[PDB]
């Protein structure tokens, strides 16, 4: 929704597929883009936790 911030590494602002929220900065990313699925207990985006994707 309008107050849910989508900031994925793909750079596309669209709400489709399985999406996951960073635990610290609240941004949403596409699981497929980030290489994860909902079975993770804790998630941080690539800016809160720099790493190759």
């Amino acid at each position: 929704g309008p107050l849910d911030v989508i900031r994925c590494i793909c750079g596309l602002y669209k709400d489709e597929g399985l999406m996951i929220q960073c635990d610290k900065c609240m941004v949403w990313q596409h699981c497929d883009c980030m290489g994860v699925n909902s079975d993770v207990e804790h998630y941080l985006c690539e800016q809160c936790d720099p790493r190759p994707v």
Partner: peptide, 6 residues
């Protein structure tokens, strides 16, 4: 972790 799917 918090997930959704629309």
């Amino acid at each position: 972790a918090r997930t959704k799917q629309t």
